[PDB]
Amino acid sequence: EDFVKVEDLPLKGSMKFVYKEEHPFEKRRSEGEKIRKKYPDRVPVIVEKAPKARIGDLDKKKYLVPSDLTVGQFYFLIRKRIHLRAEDALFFFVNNVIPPTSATMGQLYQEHHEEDFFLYIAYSDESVYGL
């Protein structure tokens, strides 16, 4: 076979969240409902590493963030927890799309939260999962 075999790129929708494998729907839905009632100005977020990414692991998965925090500021928060420089690449994906840095986390949540009331974000060193 004379071909360049393309086997190292992540195909759409292949992401799987450990958080959802380990905690069943009714228990996530329960907690997400409660936290959204108790803190209406904040959103609950799950962050895990995208398929095939080459990048440092994240220590913590679950974040409770102000609705008015921007995506650009959440990139800063995550960079710091993984000990990346500002010059090191980092991309987020929500429902397989790269969100704009100008959006707020509250806008992302309203448009994209799942039915357990959490917003799910994947991260990588490259953009390709979202293209």
Author numbering: -13 to 117
Sentences copied from the publication:
Mammalian ATG8 proteins comprise two subfamilies, namely LC3s (LC3A, LC3B, and LC3C) and GABARAPs (GABARAP, GABARAP-L1, and GABARAP-L2). ATG8 proteins promote autophagosome formation, elongation, and closure, as well as fusion with lysosomes. The canonical LIR motif is a small Θ0-X1-X2-Γ3 motif, where Θ represents an aromatic residue (W/F/Y) and Γ an aliphatic residue (L/V/I) (whose side chains bind to hydrophobic pocket 1 (HP1) and HP2 of the LIR docking site (LDS), respectively) and X represents any amino acid (aa). In this study, we examined the molecular determinants that regulate selective binding of the centriolar satellite (CS) marker protein PCM1 (pericentriolar material 1) and the ULK1 complex to GABARAPs.
We recently showed that the CS protein PCM1 binds directly to GABARAP through a canonical LIR motif regulating GABARAP-specific autophagosome formation and GABARAP stability. To elucidate the molecular basis of the PCM1-GABARAP interaction, we determined the crystal structure of the PCM11951–1964 LIR motif bound to GABARAP. The structure was solved in two different space groups P212121 and P43 at a resolution of 1.55 and 1.86 Å, respectively. Both structures displayed identical canonical LIR interactions comprising PCM1 hydrophobic residues F1955 (Θ0) and V1958 (Γ3) deeply bound to HP1 and HP2, as well as three hydrogen bonds formed between the main chains of PCM1 LIR residues V1956 (X1) and V1958 (Γ3) and the main chains of GABARAP residues K48GAB and L50GAB. On top of these canonical LIR interactions additional specific contacts were observed in both PCM1:GABARAP structures. Within the core LIR motif, V1956PCM1 in position X1 formed a hydrophobic interaction with Y49GAB of HP2. Notably, the adjacent C-terminal region engaged in multiple interactions: (1) a salt bridge between E1959PCM1 (X4) and R28GAB, (2) a large hydrophobic contact between L1961PCM1 (X6) and L55GAB, F62GAB, L63GAB, and (3) two hydrogen bonds between the side chain of Q59GAB and the main chain of P1962PCM1 (X7), as well as K1964PCM1 (X9) through a water molecule. Our structural analysis showed that the region C-terminal to the PCM1 core LIR motif contributes to stabilizing GABARAP interaction. Why is the X2 LIR residue of PCM1 affecting binding to LC3s more than GABARAPs? Both M359ULK1 and M446ATG13 (position X2 in the ULK1 and ATG13 LIRs) form hydrophobic interactions with Y25GAB and L50GAB, whereas the charged and longer side chain of K1957PCM1 only partially engages with the hydrophobic surface of GABARAP. Whereas mutation of the GIM motif residues (X1 and Γ3) had opposing or only mild effects, mutation of the lysine in position X2 (K1957IPCM1) dramatically increased both LC3 subfamily (LC3B: 95-fold; LC3A/LC3C: 75- and 47-fold, respectively) and GABARAP subfamily (~12-fold) binding.
